[PDB]
Amino acid sequence: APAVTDLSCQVVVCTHSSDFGGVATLSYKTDKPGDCAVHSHSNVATLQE
Amino acid sequence: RTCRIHEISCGAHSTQCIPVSWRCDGENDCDSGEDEENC
Ligand SMILES: [Ca+2]
C-alpha cells in the first residue's frame, strides 16, 4: 500500500442536508500512487466513498 | 518503464508506472489516454 503521511483536511463546503452535502479535500504525502481505503471514525459524518 | 508487473506505464512520452487496477477504470490517470483506450 501507499505510505500516506502528513494527512490533513479542510472542508470546502458543508450543508448538513440529508444527502452528502459536505465536501472535504484531503492533502496527503504518499510515496507511490495506489488505492487507499478511507473511513470516518466518528458517526457524526458518513463518507460517500 | 517496465516496472514490476503490478504496475503498467500509463504512457510512452515519459515513464509513469501506475497500478494496473486503474486500466479501464473509467478515467485517464496520466498524460496519455491509454487507461481507457480499446479495453
Ligand atoms: Ca485510469
Short mmCIF file of C-alpha atoms and ligand atoms in Angstrom, two decimals:
data_model
loop_
_atom_site.label_atom_id
_atom_site.label_comp_id
_atom_site.label_asym_id
_atom_site.label_seq_id
_atom_site.Cartn_x
_atom_site.Cartn_y
_atom_site.Cartn_z
CA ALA A 1 0.00 0.00 0.00
CA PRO A 2 0.92 3.71 -0.19
CA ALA A 3 2.82 5.12 2.79
CA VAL A 4 0.39 8.00 3.24
CA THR A 5 1.76 10.68 5.57
CA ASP A 6 1.12 14.32 6.54
CA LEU A 7 -2.62 13.77 6.08
CA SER A 8 -4.57 16.98 6.71
CA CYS A 9 -8.10 18.14 5.96
CA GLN A 10 -10.09 21.22 5.06
CA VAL A 11 -13.84 21.17 4.41
CA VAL A 12 -14.52 23.02 1.16
CA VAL A 13 -18.28 23.22 1.73
CA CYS A 14 -20.73 21.73 4.21
CA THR A 15 -24.50 21.73 4.27
CA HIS A 16 -25.98 19.37 6.85
CA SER A 17 -28.58 18.24 4.30
CA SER A 18 -29.97 14.71 4.07
CA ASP A 19 -27.69 13.91 1.12
CA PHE A 20 -23.86 14.04 1.01
CA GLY A 21 -23.87 17.80 1.46
CA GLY A 22 -20.28 18.19 2.69
CA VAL A 23 -17.03 18.08 0.71
CA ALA A 24 -13.59 17.68 2.33
CA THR A 25 -10.35 17.92 0.27
CA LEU A 26 -7.63 15.72 1.88
CA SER A 27 -3.98 16.87 1.50
CA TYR A 28 -1.53 13.93 1.90
CA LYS A 29 2.11 12.96 1.17
CA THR A 30 2.36 9.44 -0.36
CA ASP A 31 5.43 7.52 -1.64
CA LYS A 32 3.56 5.82 -4.50
CA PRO A 33 0.18 6.01 -6.23
CA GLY A 34 -2.39 3.50 -5.05
CA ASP A 35 -5.87 2.71 -3.80
CA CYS A 36 -6.28 3.66 -0.14
CA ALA A 37 -9.27 2.71 1.95
CA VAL A 38 -10.92 5.75 3.53
CA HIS A 39 -13.18 5.87 6.58
CA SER A 40 -14.73 8.33 9.02
CA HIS A 41 -14.32 7.05 12.56
CA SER A 42 -16.94 9.34 14.15
CA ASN A 43 -20.57 8.64 13.30
CA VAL A 44 -21.46 12.36 13.14
CA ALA A 45 -20.48 12.20 9.45
CA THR A 46 -20.63 9.31 6.96
CA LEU A 47 -18.47 9.35 3.85
CA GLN A 48 -19.75 8.59 0.37
CA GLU A 49 -16.76 6.61 -0.94
CA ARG B 1 9.20 1.86 -17.93
CA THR B 2 8.55 -1.88 -17.43
CA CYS B 3 8.15 -1.66 -13.66
CA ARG B 4 7.02 -4.60 -11.54
CA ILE B 5 4.13 -6.46 -13.13
CA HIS B 6 1.64 -4.98 -10.65
CA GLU B 7 2.29 -1.65 -12.41
CA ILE B 8 1.84 -0.51 -16.01
CA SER B 9 3.36 2.50 -17.74
CA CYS B 10 0.40 4.81 -18.46
CA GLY B 11 2.28 6.43 -21.34
CA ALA B 12 5.28 6.38 -23.64
CA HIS B 13 6.43 10.02 -23.84
CA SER B 14 7.72 9.71 -20.27
CA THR B 15 7.96 6.94 -17.69
CA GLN B 16 4.94 6.77 -15.38
CA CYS B 17 4.17 3.39 -13.80
CA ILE B 18 0.74 3.24 -12.12
CA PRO B 19 -1.50 0.49 -10.69
CA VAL B 20 -2.90 -1.95 -13.25
CA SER B 21 -6.21 -1.63 -11.37
CA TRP B 22 -6.62 1.81 -13.00
CA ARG B 23 -6.62 0.45 -16.56
CA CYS B 24 -10.16 0.82 -17.96
CA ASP B 25 -11.21 2.19 -14.56
CA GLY B 26 -13.28 5.00 -16.13
CA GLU B 27 -10.77 7.87 -16.15
CA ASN B 28 -7.41 8.78 -17.64
CA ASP B 29 -4.92 8.90 -14.76
CA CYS B 30 -1.93 10.29 -16.67
CA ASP B 31 -0.78 12.42 -19.60
CA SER B 32 -1.67 9.68 -22.11
CA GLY B 33 -5.07 8.19 -22.83
CA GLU B 34 -4.14 4.51 -22.53
CA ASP B 35 -6.13 3.96 -19.37
CA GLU B 36 -9.34 3.69 -21.37
CA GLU B 37 -8.38 3.01 -25.00
CA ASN B 38 -9.61 -0.20 -26.68
CA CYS B 39 -10.20 -2.09 -23.42
CA CA C 1 -7.49 5.02 -15.06
#
